[PDB]
């Protein structure tokens, strides 16, 4: 079947450059155009080209043609798009896509989502939330950049930006048999750091 | 760049109910190079109608396209919970293609209060100096909600990050969380904390609060 794969997440400082990949399986690489779009939150779909594997031609949206290159490696049937000259309005979810019959979108990568900004990568401070059905939760504060995963041993709230640094909580709903007696842990993932936390839902007092 | 204005720009419906929205385009295009997609949160788009009128992949066969020149639309013929989504148009008959800036559409249901939960800080937390009170507003419709945050009695306005969940897929509810951040100094000072909401299902607010005398 075919497939999208994006490469992950990446933080950069203004003025930098950075190139995101988009490895294609499933089908005959050279024979579909992929195209490269751009989605700031809330908003819609802004095209910034496309790249034609077969003869290496890209064709770019004028408003691109200077800060986007659009290649492609035919061995690895890896597409890949670098921008350049980064400002925080490049900051955005970035798909590609492949061209389909009358030039329909088909089958879409998953996104890549680049952050612009100068703040420092922060690994997350993670806290308990302690008080028949019982609710518990997590706080998650004074991490940079996004995303954050909370797993428990649900309600996850997306995160909120203030100073730069994200507060994001998570909140779980056990019966009162259950906690305190039990362990129950909220495990954070920040992978922009590389780091984890295993927060053990304590009692007060 | 041919501009693409999708109406409405939001709205709700109830299941079984027929919906229709429509993409306007300021040139002519042809039926051949329109088409549609569907967007979940968090999630990227998917190819839902191409060349007009014709169905995706696995889009159930309650959608459907209709169009040409510089009117299209896409009709749902009865509603489901799965089907709350941004639908996006797009033209490919001129380069640069362009896109809507989509109709989102939402699933109305049954008003339902929400569960209040409050929390305090953690004394990790207070170790490092700050302190931060939660509460969570959970399960909720319609989304329209205030919450208010009080110390002593007395509102608090300053220090407070809201964040509201997309729709359930399941429930079609919302939740929301309301993190108020105090120092410690601050914190310490003061006996009492109540989150209180306010929501059309009750003419009571629901409140919930914690001492530090506990
Ligand atoms: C497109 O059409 C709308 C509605 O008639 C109009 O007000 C708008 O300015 C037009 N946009 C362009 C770029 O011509």
């Known amino acids: 079947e075919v497939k999208l794969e994006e490469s992950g997440p990446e933080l950069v400082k203004p003025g930098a450059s950075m190139k995101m990949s988009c490895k294609a399986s499933?089908?005959?690489?050279?024979?579909?155009?992929i195209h490269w779009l751009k989605q700031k939150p809330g908003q819609g779909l802004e095209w910034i080209g496309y790249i034609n594997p077969y003869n290496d031609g890209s064709k770019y949206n004028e408003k691109f043609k200077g800060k986007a290159t659009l290649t492609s490696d035919k061995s690895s049937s890896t597409a890949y798009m670098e921008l350049s000259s980064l400002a925080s309005e490049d900051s955005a979810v970035y798909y590609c896509?492949?061209?389909?019959?009358?030039?329909?979108?088909?089958?879409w990568g998953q996104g890549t989502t680049l952050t612009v900004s100068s703040a420092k990568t922060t690994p997350p401070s993670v806290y308990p939330l302690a008080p028949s059905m019982v609710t518990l939760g997590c706080l998650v504060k004074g991490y940079f950049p996004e995303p954050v995963t909370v797993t428990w041993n649900v309600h996850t709230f997306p995160a909120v930006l203030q100073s730069d640094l994200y507060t994001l909580s998570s909140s779980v709903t056990v019966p009162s048999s259950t906690w305190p007696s039990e362990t129950v842990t909220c495990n954070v993932a920040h992978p922009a750091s590389s780091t984890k936390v295993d927060k053990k839902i304590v009692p007060r007092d | 760049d041919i501009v693409l204005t999708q109406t409405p720009a939001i709205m709700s419906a109830s299941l079984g109910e027929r919906v229709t929205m429509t993409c306007t385009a300021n040139?002519?295009?042809?039926?051949?190079?329109f088409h549609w997609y569907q967007q979940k949160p968090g999630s990227s788009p998917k190819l839902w109608i191409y060349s007009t009128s014709n169905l995706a992949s696995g889009v159930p066969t309650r959608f459907s396209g209709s169009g040409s020149g510089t009117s299209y639309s896409l009709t749902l013929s009865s509603m489901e919970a799965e089907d709350a989504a941004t639908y996006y148009c797009?033209?490919?008959?001129?380069?640069?293609?362009?896109f809507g800036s989509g109709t989102k559409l939402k699933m109305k249901r049954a008003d339902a209060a929400p569960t209040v939960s409050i929390f305090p800080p953690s004394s990790e937390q207070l170790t490092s100096g700050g302190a931060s009170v939660v509460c969570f507003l959970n399960n909720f419709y319609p989304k329209d909600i205030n919450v208010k945050w009080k110390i002593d009695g007395s509102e608090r306005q300053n220090g407070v990050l809201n964040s509201w969940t997309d729709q359930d897929s399941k429930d079609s509810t919302y939740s929301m969380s309301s993190t108020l951040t105090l120092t410690k100094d601050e914190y310490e000072r003061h006996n009492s904390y109540t989150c209180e909401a306010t929501h059309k299902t009750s003419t009571s607010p629901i409140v919930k609060s914690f001492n530090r005398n506990e």
């Open positions: 896509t492949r061209n389909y019959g009358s030039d329909s979108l088909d089958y």
């Open positions: 499933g089908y005959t690489f050279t024979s579909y155009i």
């Open positions: 797009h033209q490919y008959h001129r380069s640069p293609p362009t």
């Open positions: 040139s002519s295009v042809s039926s051949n190079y």
